[PDB]
Amino acid sequence: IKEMPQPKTFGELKNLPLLNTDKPVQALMKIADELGEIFKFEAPGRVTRYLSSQRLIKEACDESRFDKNLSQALKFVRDFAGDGLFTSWTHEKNWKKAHNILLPSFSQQAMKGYHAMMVDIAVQLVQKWERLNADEHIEVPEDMTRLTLDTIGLCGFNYRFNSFYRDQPHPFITSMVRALDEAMNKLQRANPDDPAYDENKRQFQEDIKVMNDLVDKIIADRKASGEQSDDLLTHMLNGKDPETGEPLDDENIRYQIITFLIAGHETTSGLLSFALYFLVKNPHVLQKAAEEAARVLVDPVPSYKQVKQLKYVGMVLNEALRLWPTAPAFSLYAKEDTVLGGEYPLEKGDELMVLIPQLHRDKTIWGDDVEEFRPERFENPSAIPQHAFKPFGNGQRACIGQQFALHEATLVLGMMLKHFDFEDHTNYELDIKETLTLKPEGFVVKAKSKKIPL
Numbered sequence: 001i002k003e004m005p006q007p008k009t010f011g012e013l014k015n016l017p018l019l020n021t022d023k024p025v026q027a028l029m030k031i032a033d034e035l036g037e038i039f040k041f042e043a044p045g046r047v048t049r050y051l052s053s054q055r056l057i058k059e060a061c062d063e064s065r066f067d068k069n070l071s072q073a074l075k076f077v078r079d080f081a082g083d084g085l086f087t088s089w090t091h092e093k094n095w096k097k098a099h100n101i102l103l104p105s106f107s108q109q110a111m112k113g114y115h116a117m118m119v120d121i122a123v124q125l126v127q128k129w130e131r132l133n134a135d136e137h138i139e140v141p142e143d144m145t146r147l148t149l150d151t152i153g154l155c156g157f158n159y160r161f162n163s164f165y166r167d168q169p170h171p172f173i174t175s176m177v178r179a180l181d182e183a184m185n186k187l188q189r190a191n192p193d194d195p196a197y198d199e200n201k202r203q204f205q206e207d208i209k210v211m212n213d214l215v216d217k218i219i220a221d222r223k224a225s226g227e228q229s230d231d232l233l234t235h236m237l238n239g240k241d242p243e244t245g246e247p248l249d250d251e252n253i254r255y256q257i258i259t260f261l262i263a264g265h266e267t268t269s270g271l272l273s274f275a276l277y278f279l280v281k282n283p284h285v286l287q288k289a290a291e292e293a294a295r296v297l298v299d300p301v302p303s304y305k306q307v308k309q310l311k312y313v314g315m316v317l318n319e320a321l322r323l324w325p326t327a328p329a330f331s332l333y334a335k336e337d338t339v340l341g342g343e344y345p346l347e348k349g350d351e352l353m354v355l356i357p358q359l360h361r362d363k364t365i366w367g368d369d370v371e372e373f374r375p376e377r378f379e380n381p382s383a384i385p386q387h388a389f390k391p392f393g394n395g396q397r398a399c400i401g402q403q404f405a406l407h408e409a410t411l412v413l414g415m416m417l418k419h420f421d422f423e424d425h426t427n428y429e430l431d432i433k434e435t436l437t438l439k440p441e442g443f444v445v446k447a448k449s450k451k452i453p454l
C-alpha cells in the first residue's frame with residue numbers, strides 16, 4: 001500500500017488556493033502531469049483524490065464499489081437544479097423515478113421524433129452564415145451556443161428562444177448564466193461568510209427566483225392548454241414510473257427543465273466548437289469529413305437516416321470529446337471500505353474525482369501520440385478498452401442526453417461541412433474558458449459558401 005502524492009499547500013488553506021484561478025480543470029491537468037495517476041487534494045474540512053489513469057478509473061467505475069457523489073460544484077448547482085437527474089443522489093426516490101420516466105424520451109429511437117425540430121435550428125445557423133458579408137467572420141462558440149440552446153428549448157418544451165434574432169440573452173439565460181457563474185466562483189472562496197459576498201448572495205437568490213418563476217409558468221401554461229406536443233414537457237406531464245406507478249410532480253418537472261437548459265447551453269455547444277477548432281487545425285481531416293458530408297447529405301434537408309450514415313463526422317466528434325471532454329470531471333464515493341488498485345485503501349464514504357481529460361491522455365491506452373487529433377482512433381468502437389473513454393460519465397449515472405447531443409452535433413457539423421469551406425483567418429491560439437464546461441474562447445473563422453441551396 002503506497003502513500004499518495006499531494007500538490008503544494010498554503011498553510012491552513014491546504015490545497016484550496018490552487019482553485020483560485022479561472023482555469024481550474026487546466027490547473028488540475030498540469031498537477032496530474034506532474035504527480036501521475038492519483039493525488040490527494042485537501043481543503044479545510046474536505047479531502048478528495050484525483051484519478052487520471054484507466055487502470056484506477058476502471059475500478060472507480062465499478063458500480064458495486066462506488067456510486068455518484070455530488071462534488072461541491074454539483075451541491076451549489078443543486079440550489080437551482082434541485083433533485084433533477086444531474087444533481088440528485090442515486091438513493092433519492094426522485095432520481096430513479098425521473099430516470100425510468102425519461103429514459104425512453106432520450107433513446108436513439110426517440111431521436112427520429114426530435115429530428116425535424118433540430119433541422120429547424122440547424123437551417124437557421126446555415127442561413128445565418130450564408131447571409132454574412134465577405135468582410136465578416138463567425139464567432140464560433142457564440143453561434144454554437146445559440147443553436148444548442150434553441151434546439152433544447154424547442155425539443156424540451158416547444159419554446160423558441162430565437163437566439164439567432166438577438167445579441168442579448170433571454171431573461172431566463174441571463175439568470176442561468178449568472179447563477180452558474182456564482183456556483184463555480186463559490187468553489188474557491190476561503191471566507192464565504194465575509195460581507196463582501198452579500199451582493200453575490202442577494203443576486204443568486206434573485207436569479208433562482210427568475211428561473212423558478214419562468215419555468216413554473218411554462219409548466220402551468222402547458223397543463224392549462226391540454227396541448228399534446230411531442231416534447232419532453234408532454235412526456236413528463238403524461239409519464240408514469242412503472243416501479244412506483246407515480247408521475248413526476250410539477251416542482252421536479254421544473255428541476256428537469258432547468259437541468260436540460262443548463263446542458264443544452266453548456267455542453268453540446270463546447271463539443272461543436274472544439275470539433276470545428278480541430279478540423280480547421282487539421283485540414284486533411286476536414287477534407288475527409290467534408291467529402292463524407294457531400295456524399296451522404298444529397299437532399300436540401302438532411303433526413304434522420306442520412307445523419308446515422310455520417311460515420312466519419314461521428315469519429316471527429318468522439319476525437320474532440322477525447323481531447324476536450326466539455327463536461328470534464330465527475331465524482332464518486334466508496335459504498336464500502338475497499339482498496340483501489342491493490343495500493344490505496346479507502347474507507348466507506350471516501351470521495352474520488354475523475355479527471356476525464358487526463359484519462360483520455362493515458363498513453364497505456366491511446367499510444368504515445370495522445371495529443372494528435374486522429375478520428376481513426378474511433379473507426380471501431382469495440383477496440384476501445386472498457387472505461388478508457390468516458391465523456392458521458394459512468395453506468396446508470398451516465399449522461400441521459402448522450403444520443404440527443406450526438407444526433408444534434410452530427411447533424412449540425414454535417415450541414416456546416418456540406419455548405420461551407422472554412423478559414424482559420426487569425427491563426428487562432430486555443431484559449432479554453434471554463435464555466436461548468438470547457439469552450440474555446442475567442443475562436444473565430446471565416447466561412448466561404450459552397451452555394452448549395454437548402
Ligand code: HEM
Pocket residue numbers: 068085086087099152259260263264267268271321325326327329330331390391392393394396397398399400401402404405
Ligand atoms: C442537450 C444535451 C444534454 C442533456 C439534455 C444532458 C443531460 C444530462 C443529465 C440529465 C445528466 C444526469 C443523468 C443522471 O445522473 O441520471 C447528465 C449527466 C452527464 N452529462 Fe449530460 N446532457 C447533455 C449533453 C452532454 C454532453 C454533450 C456531455 C459531454 C460532452 C455531457 C456529459 C455528461 C456527464 C459527464 C454526465 C455525468 C455527470 C456526473 O457523473 O456528475 N452531457 N447529462
Ligand SMILES: O=C(O)[C@H](Cc1ccccc1)NC(=O)[C@@H]1CCCCN1C(=O)CCC1CCCC1
Pocket residue numbers: 016019024025028041042043046048071072073074187326327328329330353436437
Ligand atoms: O467541486 C468540487 O468538489 C471539485 C473542486 C473542489 C475540490 C476540493 C475543494 C473544493 C472544491 N471540483 C472539481 O474538481 C472539478 C474540476 C475543476 C472545476 C470544478 N469541477 C467540477 O466537477 C465542476 C462540476 C462540473 C459538472 C459537469 C462537469 C464538471
